[PDB]
Enzyme design. Structure first.
Site, mmCIF file in Angstrom:
data_model
loop_
_atom_site.group_PDB
_atom_site.id
_atom_site.type_symbol
_atom_site.label_atom_id
_atom_site.label_comp_id
_atom_site.label_asym_id
_atom_site.label_seq_id
_atom_site.Cartn_x
_atom_site.Cartn_y
_atom_site.Cartn_z
ATOM 1 N N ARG A 82 -1.256 27.404 31.252
ATOM 2 C CA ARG A 82 -2.218 27.813 32.262
ATOM 3 C C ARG A 82 -2.659 29.243 32.010
ATOM 4 N NH1 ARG A 82 0.388 25.896 36.776
ATOM 5 N NH2 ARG A 82 -1.486 26.489 37.940
ATOM 6 N N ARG A 92 -2.973 32.828 27.525
ATOM 7 C CA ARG A 92 -2.519 31.726 28.373
ATOM 8 C C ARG A 92 -1.013 31.580 28.278
ATOM 9 N NH1 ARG A 92 -6.483 28.006 30.148
ATOM 10 N NH2 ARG A 92 -4.680 26.552 30.171
ATOM 11 N N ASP A 95 -0.084 29.547 23.872
ATOM 12 C CA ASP A 95 -1.108 29.813 22.903
ATOM 13 C C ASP A 95 -0.917 28.971 21.629
ATOM 14 O OD1 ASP A 95 -2.033 31.852 24.541
ATOM 15 O OD2 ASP A 95 -2.140 33.348 22.902
ATOM 16 N N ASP A 97 -3.076 28.590 18.013
ATOM 17 C CA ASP A 97 -4.152 29.081 17.189
ATOM 18 C C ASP A 97 -4.136 28.373 15.831
ATOM 19 O OD1 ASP A 97 -5.598 31.592 18.394
ATOM 20 O OD2 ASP A 97 -3.429 31.862 18.793
#
Length: 158
Positions: A82, A92, A95, A97
């Site tokens: 969240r 958040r 994460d 990536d």
């Protein structure tokens, strides 16, 4: 194609969250996890002294297109984490990536690969080097050379 994904988390009990995220990553269609790094510890950002971040790298073999994989990582961020109500724009609670996507270079509105700042981030590079020590970036730069030259400090283990 082997995609390399960075995972980060400080919230609740990071081990529990990260393991749940790993399961979600393994469940992405047309994809499987090849290997997961050790779990690393990185100190919070800000003098206020927040919880430590848990950091890791995942090698994901996938036949998805890069933006398809992005859809899934975004979905998992939504489902498993969240935003911070005070810092909606900040990072958040979980994460994900995409750091690298095979040897592809991608500069689209939603996706930039290689991750635009990863060569400046020991917390991304060290876990990656554990699972891909011979990695070479699409521009020809060797992961080992960047760590050696830029003399990053190692990370402690989680």
């Amino acid at each position: 194609t082997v995609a390399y994904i960075a995972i980060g988390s400080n919230l609740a009990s990071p081990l529990e969250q990260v393991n749940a995220a790993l399961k979600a990553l393994g469940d992405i269609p047309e994809s499987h996890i090849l290997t997961v790094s050790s779990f690393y510890r990185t100190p919070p950002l800000g003098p206020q002294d927040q919880p430590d971040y848990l950091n890791a790298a995942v090698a994901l073999e996938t036949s998805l297109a890069p933006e398809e994989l992005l859809n899934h990582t975004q979905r998992i961020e939504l489902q498993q984490g969240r935003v911070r109500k005070a810092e909606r724009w900040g990072p958040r609670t979980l994460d994900l990536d995409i750091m690298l996507f095979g040897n592809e270079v991608i500069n689209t509105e939603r996706l930039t690969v290689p991750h635009y700042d990863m060569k400046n981030r020991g917390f991304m590079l060290w876990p990656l080097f554990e699972i891909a020590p011979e990695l070479v970036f699409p521009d020809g730069e060797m992961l080992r050379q960047i760590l050696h030259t830029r003399a990053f400090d190692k990370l402690n283990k989680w």
